[PDB]
């Protein structure tokens, strides 16, 4: 559906999807490497 | 317009006019109302059919021959746990490279039809198929059956689609049967044939 695809490109839905994926990535990154205070490499 | 319908007495969708092979007017949700989605979905269905037919053959023919005792192959469910000549990740990477070259050229033929019909190395060699998803030529149609009158084609292309759909259903059935009953698919058939009234879910 073209209209359904248009509704998925509206600002709030796109922002929600982007921020959900971003939060998931950050949570997993902090889960794999906990308590980072310095960049050791 | 007078073709048999999935729901007799009803009205088929407007975008399904009966021009495609294997068309019965089944699209309640309108997932392919626009032409581009229609083409993409047709190509996806054709590829899923062809992989599911290879998978159904490979799941069921080996397992049957093991039961009658001619071969001694392991279960298809745990076939990925045996130890082969190398680690599984290396095989996955080789697969990824080869299938990436194979599928990458298939992507360009969907976007721009008839642009990848020439051999990059030996330009004397060509594919002959006019239709996206039916490539033809000496590689994919060595017997030359894949071309003919529209009557000869709309039968063969409908036979392919009807077989592929059945294979997809069978493959998913085998997966869920092994998940639930915890035994190979052929044992389930013999159990059902032994006591059809009670050998059931």
């Amino acid at each position: 559906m073209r209209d359904l695809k248009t509704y998925l490109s509206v600002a709030p839905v796109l922002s929600t999807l982007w921020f959900g994926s971003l939060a998931g990535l950050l949570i997993e990154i902090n889960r794999l490497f906990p308590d980072a205070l310095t960049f050791p490499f | 317009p007078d073709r048999p319908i999935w729901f007799p007495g009803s009205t088929p969708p407007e975008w399904l006019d009966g021009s495609l092979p294997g068309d019965f007017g089944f699209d309640p949700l309108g997932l392919s109302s626009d032409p581009d989605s229609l083409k993409w979905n047709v190509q996806a269905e054709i590829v899923h059919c062809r992989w599911a037919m290879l998978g159904a053959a490979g799941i069921f023919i080996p397992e049957f021959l093991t039961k009658i005792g001619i071969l001694n192959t392991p279960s298809w469910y745990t076939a990925g746990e045996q130890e082969y000549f190398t680690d599984k990740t290396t095989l996955f990477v080789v697969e990824l490279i080869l299938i990436g070259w194979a599928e990458g050229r298939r992507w360009a033929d969907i976007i721009k039809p008839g642009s990848v019909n020439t051999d990059p190395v030996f330009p004397n060699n060509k594919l002959t198929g006019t239709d996206v998803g039916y490539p033809g030529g000496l590689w994919f149609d060595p017997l030359g059956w894949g071309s003919g009158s529209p009557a000869k084609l709309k039968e063969l292309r409908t036979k392919e689609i009807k077989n592929g759909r059945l294979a997809m259903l069978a493959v998913m059935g085998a997966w869920f049967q092994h998940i639930y009953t915890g035994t190979g698919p052929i044992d389930n058939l013999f159990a059902h044939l032994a006591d059809p009234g009670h050998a059931t879910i």
């Binding site: - | 990740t89 290396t90 642009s115 990848v116």
Partner: protein, 196 residues
């Protein structure tokens, strides 16, 4: 000329008049003609330097199979003692390369302005293109046809990728570029980036 990806269209600014033009610019850096003019020279110089770098990093290690010399690895060549201190050599290198690269740079700005010798005025480079000086830089008078330029660019790109591989492998494996090849050739299916 050729397409880097069949089924895709070439950019408008890549008209095929340049050597080694395969229409590869997914990120559109060379849209501005000034950017293209600068990047052509950048690619030429980078490839020409990388080819020599790879040739010097590989062959002095191939000696092991033939056993002519005894030379340390390319990553241990610096620590060896030489007739002069490292600082003095670096200073001399800087002094010479400053003049050389400033002389080269002036041709990109105003072509044909640095073709004359500064001390002996009777000596001058024949007129040529921006990145191809010619003259005494081409003693054997080989014709700079487009085929040779395309070969040069292809070799430069391959050598640049080879140098990147040489750098990355040492950080992980810790051995030489040639030793990495023999180990792979011993057991090909077990000795890859996937160690297992």
């Amino acid at each position: 000329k050729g397409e880097w990806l069949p089924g895709l269209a070439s950019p408008d600014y890549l008209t095929g008049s340049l050597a080694g033009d395969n229409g590869f610019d997914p990120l559109g850096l060379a849209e501005d003609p000034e950017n293209l003019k600068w990047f052509v020279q950048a690619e030429l110089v980078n490839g020409r330097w990388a080819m020599l770098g790879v040739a010097g990093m590989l062959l002095p290690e191939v000696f092991t199979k033939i056993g002519i010399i005894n030379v340390p690895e390319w990553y241990d060549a610096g620590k060896e003692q030489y007739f002069a201190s490292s600082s003095t050599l670096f200073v001399i290198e800087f002094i010479l390369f400053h003049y050389v690269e400033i002389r080269r740079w002036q041709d990109i700005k105003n072509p044909g302005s640095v073709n004359q010798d500064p001390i002996f005025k009777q000596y001058s480079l024949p007129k040529g293109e921006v990145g191809y000086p010619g003259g005494i830089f081409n003693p054997l008078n080989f014709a700079p046809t487009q085929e040779a330029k395309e070969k040069e660019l292809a070799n430069g790109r391959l050598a640049m990728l080879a140098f990147l591989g040489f750098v990355v492998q040492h950080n992980v494996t810790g051995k030489g570029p040639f030793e990495n090849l023999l180990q792979h050739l011993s057991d090909p299916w077990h000795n890859t980036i996937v160690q297992t």
